[PDB]
């Protein structure tokens with residue numbers, strides 16, 4: 001069994017026996033599966049735009065689209081935009097849980113950060129994208145484009161996105177990038193929209209916009 005190079009979480013995640021699939025164990029309940037099916041039926045468009053494809057269930061394993069598959073040299077960042085179980089966010093509106101090569105920059109998932117340190121970590125994650133300034137900006141701008149639509153669409157969705165993350169990805173050559181929403185294990189039905197989760201996305205859009213705009 002080939003272990004999947006996670007960037008965060010404690011979940012058992014392996015490569016599928018097949019190309020472009022990862023197998024994630026549902027450790028505690030089947031809630032993740034219940035939530036994908038509910039979103040599939042009530043917010044189909046949201047699932048297609050923002051969420052890795054669920055190809056199937058196998059006992060307690062979900063077969064999920066590998067978001068890294070189409071990438072020569074993927075850089076991954078996990079940012080928790082949903083509410084934490086009991087702790088407050090390490091960056092106010094959201095918590096960076098890890099990124100490719102975070103070890104090299106002495107990143108610590110338990111450390112509460114200033115705005116300066118939050119921004120510095122996101123710049124650290126962007127460093128593997130090289131010094132072509134007008135190409136790493138294109139990556140930031142494609143992220144802003146999809147996070148913008150996601151925030152907009154979140155106003156119309158009556159779920160509490162407890163625990164969910166954004167997986168940011170970009171290839172070393174900056175030819176390709178994306179961001180998707182993952183990990184529905186703790187998501188709940190509610191009667192309003194999730195303003196906490198919306199503020200996380202808007203705060204990220206703000207930070208990425210300041211990076212896409214500064215001239216340094």
Ligand SMILES: O=P(O)(O)O[C@H]1[C@H](OP(=O)(O)O)[C@@H](OP(=O)(O)O)[C@H](OP(=O)(O)O)[C@@H](OP(=O)(O)O)[C@@H]1OP(=O)(O)O
Pocket residue numbers: 009010011027083084085086087162163164185186
């Ligand atoms: O051991 P795990 O089974 O992976 O449990 C993990 C929880 O997710 P579930 O798997 O749904 O329980 C996760 O909450 P969620 O991600 O649902 O929001 C916690 O984050 P928080 O309490 O919300 O901040 C993680 O702890 P910290 O992030 O360090 O607190 C915890 O992992 P760890 O305890 O091993 O680090």
Ligand SMILES: Nc1ncnc2c1ncn2[C@@H]1O[C@H](COP(=O)(O)OP(=O)(O)O)[C@@H](O)[C@H]1O
Pocket residue numbers: 005006007008009010011013022052064065066067068076078165167182183185
């Ligand atoms: N569909 C996916 N494709 C690629 N990597 C993924 C995918 N889903 C999760 N990951 C990776 O696995 C890690 C943990 O995923 P997540 O669903 O948040 O698990 P947990 O429930 O343990 O928090 C992420 O930080 C990311 O590196």
Ligand SMILES: [Mg+2]
Pocket residue numbers: 009163164165182183
């Ligand atoms: Mg998670």
